[PDB]
Design a protein around this ligand. Structure first.
Ligand SMILES: O=C(O)C[C@H](NC(=O)c1ncnc2[nH]ccc12)c1ccncc1
Length: 167
């Protein structure tokens, strides 16, 4: 049993809700919130910009120290950092940016990072400003993630479309 409320169960392990991930995180305080990161951990917009804003920029300060020490992430890769006031941990995951020419096959690799955590609150990877097809992202999620994932879809129109077209 956990504190996630109002989700539709899609499969044994995937749950979906029309919600702002920032508001879900503040309410639930999950063990792991997933950030839709870029390789530089520059949290400017979308999920990342909004999460960072909700930490009063502490996420960005921590991230800049991480990059100064370790260099950029790989597309399809991840790192675990603090969840600040939003979660115990933040799993920063880099999905491919279709607007950067990045290989959509890396979306599966990106979702594989979720399997290192028993339960996660997450956005739809590579959706929104990353330019990928969100219907495809949900399918890859369902076919890749085996741990328990609670997906927060911001746009109600998209949520309704993802549910109604789900096989
Ligand atoms: O979930 C979607 O609808 C895709 C994408 N989502 C996000 O950017 C997104 N998803 C979940 N919590 C969020 N909080 C702030 C942004 C954010 C989108 C948000 C709006 N307008 C267009 C796309």
């Amino acid at each position: 049993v956990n504190s996630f409320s109002g989700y539709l169960k899609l499969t044994d392990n995937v749950y979906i809700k029309n919600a702002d991930i920032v508001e879900e995180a503040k309410k639930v305080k999950p063990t792991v919130v997933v950030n839709a990161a870029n390789v530089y951990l520059k949290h400017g917009g979308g999920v990342a910009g909004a999460l960072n804003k909700a930490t009063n920029n502490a996420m960005q300060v921590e991230s800049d120290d991480y990059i100064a020490t370790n260099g950029p992430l790989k597309v399809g890769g991840s790192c675990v950092l603090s969840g600040h006031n939003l979660a115990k941990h933040c799993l920063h995951v880099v999905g491919p940016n279709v607007n950067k020419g990045e290989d959509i096959q890396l979306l599966k690799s990106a979702y594989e990072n979720f399997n290192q955590h028993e339960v996660l609150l997450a956005p739809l990877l590579s959706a929104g400003i990353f330019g990928a097809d969100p219907i495809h992202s949900l399918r890859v999620c369902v076919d890749t993630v085996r741990t328990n994932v609670y997906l927060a879809v911001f746009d109600k129109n998209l949520y309704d479309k993802l549910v109604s077209s789900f096989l």
